[PDB]
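Regression test case RT-17, inverse folding.

Input:
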């Protein structure tokens, strides 16, 4: 057939350069968990050219996991290994694929997730975040998305809860559990629990994902950032009523700390036609100037 084809990174064998011995690894406390597995804190000894002793985060499935889920963690590993590094992504540091279950090792971000961070500040002030800081988080997530978009990697789980804050409070997009690689649609296979309040209409109603779907999600995140971590569509349950509102063009109101320019960016991300939404690169231009 045609001698030229795009290379599907999920089809590539595991790259052995990421391999790290599990006995150079010491597990600590659980950072987050589910039914799929967990992410734990660990100390890595002699990892890469980094600090000889290095605090890292490690993802693993619970021993209960079936063939389905083990394969989904390898796909995740494979996607993350082809991306290359960026300053605003929770980068992959290595893996453990021999001598035991699959472990995926990534940068440890000491201040945890953005959502909880924003909520602690909101609770502390009731008992100090500035607009500049909120803009910086927004701009940094945008930069990471633009990098992902430029790899044809659609994240599919853009939310304050999946943005993490590392040294200097630098924002990084984490959790690639639903990340997928395209090229030009991605169609939803089905029945995975999904983050409905962060999903673009075409993803809900047509099971279709493009990079412009992530832009919708990013707009929701902007709403989360500038409201200091309110749940989206506050007080409105996911049901028939919600889907109607979304399809008929309902949008959340301007949050307390969002300047008009940022709300306008939000609203443009919430265009029903995905191609009428701005690109992540354009969004980087907007926030670099604000
Ligand atoms: N790669 C990571 N690096 C750090 C953390 C991480 C580190 C600490 C806390 C935390 O909960 N901390 C940090 C200050 C406040 C809070 C206090 N904890 C101490 C005891 C209970 C909560 C939360 C996450 N997680 C990572 N990956 C897992 C993950 C992703 Cl990729 C996305 C969303 C959630 C998660 Cl868990």
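Golden output:
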């Amino acid at each position: 057939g045609n001698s030229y084809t795009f290379i599907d990174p999920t089809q590539l064998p595991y790259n052995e350069k990421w391999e790290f011995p599990r006995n150079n690894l010491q597990f600590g406390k659980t950072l987050g968990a589910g039914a799929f597995g967990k992410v734990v804190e660990a100390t890595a000894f002699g990892l890469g050219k980094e600090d000889a002793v290095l605090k890292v985060a490690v993802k693993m499935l619970k021993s209960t996991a079936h063939a389905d889920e083990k394969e989904a963690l390898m796909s995740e590993l494979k996607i993350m290994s082809h991306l290359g590094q960026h300053e605003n992504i929770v980068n992959l540091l290595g893996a453990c694929t021999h001598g035991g279950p699959v472990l995926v090792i990534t940068e440890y971000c000491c201040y945890g997730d953005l959502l909880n961070f924003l909520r602690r500040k909101a609770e502390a002030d009731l008992d100090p975040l500035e607009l500049r800081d909120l803009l910086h988080f927004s701009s940094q997530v945008a930069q990471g998305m633009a990098f992902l978009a430029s790899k044809n990697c659609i994240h599919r789980d853009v939310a304050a809860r999946n943005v993490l804050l590392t040294n200097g409070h630098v924002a990084k997009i984490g959790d690639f559990g639903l990340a997928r690689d395209i090229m030009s649609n991605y169609i939803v296979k089905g029945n995975a629990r999904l983050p409905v309040k962060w999903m673009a209409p075409e993803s809900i109603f047509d099971c279709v994902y493009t990079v412009q779907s992530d832009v919708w999600s990013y707009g929701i995140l902007l709403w989360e950032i500038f409201s200091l971590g309110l749940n989206p569509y506050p007080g409105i349950l996911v049901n028939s009523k919600f889907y109607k509102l979304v399809k008929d063009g309902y949008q959340m109101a301007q949050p307390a700390f969002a300047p008009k320019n940022i709300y306008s960016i939000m609203q443009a991300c919430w265009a029903l036609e995905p191609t009428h939404r701005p690109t992540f690169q354009q969004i980087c231009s907007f926030l670099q100037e604000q």
